[PDB]
Amino acid sequence: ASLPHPKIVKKHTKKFKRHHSDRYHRVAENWRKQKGIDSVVRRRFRGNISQPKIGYGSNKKTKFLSPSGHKTFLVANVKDLETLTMHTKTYAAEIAHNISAKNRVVILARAKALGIKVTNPKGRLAL
């Protein structure tokens, strides 16, 4: 139900955690580039963590596609949904986390009608 697209190649799936985020609690995994004068990481000694750089850039084509084949589009309500009325093999809808249980049936319904895909059906669902 989505376009052709080449094989989605990811090319560095692992996460890129900040150096020594595993060493001290106070240090969060969120990346931060090592600046220090000595650092093995900043200097790239064999055996250390890899750092983000632009060569890991994803294929411009397959970029942004979720496994399905669609760029996901965050959808708050039915008006928001209907922007995806044509572009169905292109986009799919993510229903906003803060959307009340009741309204999700309505968005779910309208999308089934319009043939638009929903990335997270059975959101606030009663089962």
Task: Give the C-alpha separation, 116 to 22, whole Å.
Answer: 42
Q: Does 6 bind other proteins (CB under 8 A)?
A: no
SS3 of residue 122 by DSSP: coil
Backbone angles phi, psi at 74, to 5 degrees: -70, 125
Question: Least distance to RNA from the beta carbon of 118, Å?
Answer: 9
Is 47 a binding residue for RNA by CB under 7 A? The answer is yes
Q: Binding of RNA at residue 38 (CB under 7 A)?
A: yes
* Nearer to Mg ion among residue 1 and residue 28 (C-beta): 28
Please check whether residue 52 is in contact with residue 31, taking contact to mean a CB–CB distance below 8 angstroms. Answer: yes
CB 18 within 8 A of CB 31: yes
Q: Quick one: which of 51, 88, 103, 120 contacts other proteins (CB under 8 A)?
A: 88
- Burial class (CB within 10 angstroms; exposed 0-12, middle 13-18, buried 19+) of 84: buried
Q: Quick one: which segment of 35-43, 51-59, 79-87, 113-121 binds other proteins (CB under 8 A)? A: 79-87
For the chain, the distance separating the N- and C-terminal CA atoms, rounded to the nearest angstrom, is 27
Instruction: Work out which of 65, 73, 104, 117 binds other proteins, going by CB under 8 A.
Output: 73
Choice from 65, 70, 75, 108 touching other proteins (CB under 8 A): 75
Residue of the chain from 88, 89, 94, 114 that contacts RNA (CB under 7 A): 94
Binding site for other proteins (CB under 8 A): 3-4, 46, 73-77, 79-80, 83, 86-90, 96
